[PDB]
Amino acid sequence: ASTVVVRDGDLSSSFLAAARQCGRVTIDTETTGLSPKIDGLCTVQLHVPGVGTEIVRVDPTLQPTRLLQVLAAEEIVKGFHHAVFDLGFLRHTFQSKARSVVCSKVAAKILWPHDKDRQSLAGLAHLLLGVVLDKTPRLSDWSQPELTKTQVHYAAVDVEILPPILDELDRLLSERQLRELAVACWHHIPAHVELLEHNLGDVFTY
Amino acid sequence: ASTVVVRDGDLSSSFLAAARQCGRVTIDTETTGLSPKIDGLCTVQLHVPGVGTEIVRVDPTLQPTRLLQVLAAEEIVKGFHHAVFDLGFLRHTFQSKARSVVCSKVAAKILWPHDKDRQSLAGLAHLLLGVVLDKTPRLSDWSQPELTKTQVHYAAVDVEILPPILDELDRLLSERQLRELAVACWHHIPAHVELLEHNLGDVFTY
Ligand SMILES: [Cl-]
Ligand SMILES: [Cl-]
Numbered sequence: 119a120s121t122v123v124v125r126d127g128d129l130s131s132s133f134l135a136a137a138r139q140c141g142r143v144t145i146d147t148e149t150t151g152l153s154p155k156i157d158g159l160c161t162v163q164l165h166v167p168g169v170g171t172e173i174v175r176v177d178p179t180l181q182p183t184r185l186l187q188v189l190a191a192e193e194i195v196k197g198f199h200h201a202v203f204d205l206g207f208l209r210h211t212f213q214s215k216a217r218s219v220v221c222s223k224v225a226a227k228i229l230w231p232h233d234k235d236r237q238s239l240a241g242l243a244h245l246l247l248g249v250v251l252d253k254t255p256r257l258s259d260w261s262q263p264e265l266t267k268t269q270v271h272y273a274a275v276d277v278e279i280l281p282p283i284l285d286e287l288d289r290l291l292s293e294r295q296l297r298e299l300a301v302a303c304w305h306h307i308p309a310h311v312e313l314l315e316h317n318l319g320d321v322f323t324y
Numbered sequence: 325a326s327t328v329v330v331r332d333g334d335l336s337s338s339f340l341a342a343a344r345q346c347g348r349v350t351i352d353t354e355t356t357g358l359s360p361k362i363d364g365l366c367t368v369q370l371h372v373p374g375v376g377t378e379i380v381r382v383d384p385t386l387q388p389t390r391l392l393q394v395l396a397a398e399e400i401v402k403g404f405h406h407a408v409f410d411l412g413f414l415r416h417t418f419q420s421k422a423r424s425v426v427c428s429k430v431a432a433k434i435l436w437p438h439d440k441d442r443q444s445l446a447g448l449a450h451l452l453l454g455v456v457l458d459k460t461p462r463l464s465d466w467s468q469p470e471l472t473k474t475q476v477h478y479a480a481v482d483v484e485i486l487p488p489i490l491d492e493l494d495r496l497l498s499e500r501q502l503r504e505l506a507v508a509c510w511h512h513i514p515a516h517v518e519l520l521e522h523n524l525g526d527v528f529t530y
Pocket of ligand 2: 469
């Protein structure tokens, strides 16, 4: 959490430029609960490697125009942990339909299908980076008029830790010849979000 | 079942040409049971609209080279009913990895998520075409040294009925603005087959 600014309503015009120069960003959100179609989206965090992190506080009366630009941009890769969760909120709240998203949880489920510990952000961070993540601020009040120092730091860490985690999952995927499958699965995340948004369920079974 | 030929081991060179001229074919299979990774693949049926239908009897000692060419060909659309099932057999038996496949079951699950009747080939044929399909030969012995007249006719009908069914689902999908979602889902079928082949399960949940 080297350099973090809390923004109201939208990503700043400076980070939009930095995201476009970089071609790659990481994204996370804080909410009032676990149901992307019922609970409230409170903040969206965006990190530009080398530049810093913005915490965007959602306004009900404002589309976060420049944030939706980044999400939709084919030429900007957006890394998440559990992209289906975060994009479900973004889709239900803002009608956002993202392109070029990747997900460390999907990656982890391909590499370690039977191990829930390695499928969590904290499991990935400890295994790959030697880093212990503090998870206690996740249940705090993200709609509070002023985010605390602890909140800001927590919200920043969970986007700033994704670039090294994602790079390391890429290498493990390539080694086991599963990267093309992870690539195909990441490419399906936005469609999977639409299926959930429309209550269409599992279209691939009998 | 206007014009049907039973082929040993592979699709004929003439249908490979006709599939390439047409740019579109429909596909179905007959098997010894419902588990694509355990049960035997007995036949693969391929229909070229306007030309006819081949029933390919699988040989254990022979890759059906020209059939695998059609399956892999990006420029040839392959229509199935329940593509995940058929491609699971083709993937486990021949290591076949298909491109540009579409599926009437996936389409039906998007249009009618809660109605199992409309998600079956016979439900689709009756609703859309007014056609009653005889399903009794499905449990017959497809590894028998000579397929019966009833078997040949059954195996041919279930590929020849797919082109009108698929064209009609396209129109219903477009009308409700769900065709882009069906297109995205069809594009994911081969990856979903790989996930099942590797026992990776649902990579898109928590
Ligand atoms: Cl604040
Ligand atoms: Cl025969």
